[PDB]
Amino acid sequence: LFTGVVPILVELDGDVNGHKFSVRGEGEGDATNGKLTMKFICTTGKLPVPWPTLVTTLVLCFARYPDHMKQHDFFKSAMPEGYVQERTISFEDDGYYKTRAEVKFEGDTLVNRIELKGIDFKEDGNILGHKLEYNLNSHNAYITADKQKNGIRSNFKIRLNVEDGSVQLADHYQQNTPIGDGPVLLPDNHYLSTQNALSKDPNEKRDHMVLLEFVTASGIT
Numbered sequence: 001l002f003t004g005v006v007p008i009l010v011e012l013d014g015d016v017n018g019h020k021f022s023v024r025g026e027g028e029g030d031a032t033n034g035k036l037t038m039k040f041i042c043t044t045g046k047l048p049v050p051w052p053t054l055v056t057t058l059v060l061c062f063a064r065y066p067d068h069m070k071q072h073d074f075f076k077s078a079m080p081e082g083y084v085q086e087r088t089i090s091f092e093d094d095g096y097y098k099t100r101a102e103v104k105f106e107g108d109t110l111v112n113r114i115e116l117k118g119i120d121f122k123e124d125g126n127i128l129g130h131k132l133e134y135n136l137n138s139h140n141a142y143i144t145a146d147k148q149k150n151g152i153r154s155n156f157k158i159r160l161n162v163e164d165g166s167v168q169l170a171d172h173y174q175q176n177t178p179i180g181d182g183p184v185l186l187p188d189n190h191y192l193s194t195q196n197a198l199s200k201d202p203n204e205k206r207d208h209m210v211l212l213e214f215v216t217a218s219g220i221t
Helices: 067-072
Strands: 006-016 019-030 035-042 083-091 096-106 109-119 139-146 151-161 167-178 190-199 208-218
Touching: 006 035, 067 208, 139 167
Parallel strands: 006 109
Antiparallel strands: 006 019, 019 035, 035 208, 083 096, 083 167, 096 109, 139 151, 139 190, 151 167, 190 208
8 A cells, every 4th residue: 555656646725814725736656755746737827825834734554664673653553444634834023824625545545634814914025926945844742642632743933045145933733543433543642854945847848846855753662
């Protein structure tokens, strides 16, 4: 199921401050090496927010969990029926993203289907005003079990690069639960670490993002 390369489809329907948009993505995942390769297209025209602010919303089941941590891989153990991933994201000095997603297999394809709402952004801020560099730093995230809520949680911060040279923080608050609320593997506390390279397709005319990404779990011997 995750042994070799798996095709991925991402579908995101959003609106920020009432501006409606949609993103579709295709690529593949290789959980053996923790590797993702994707191309995302804005199917509604110009993306009304910067692409770097959507990377975390646009499949942690492809993180590399080494052998000794397989008993702590919530994301794969919930497959193929899948999980719900929900986030609140607070942007420094600006608005909020509220996201709900279902991650599951639909046939041979791993599908991430997302709804996003962005509330109370400034029209002339860094997000709606498109003032971010086209880049995303490497980041770490602490993963904990929530036995009460039958799932896992994670709170982490992302550092966005602003075109004036400053840094803008995005505080992420995350919760995952299995689709169907059935029995859930409860991991011990551990970390996920991500590297991501954002680029462009020199022949693509639509608003788009090419992504190469590497995610690895650590923290349990």
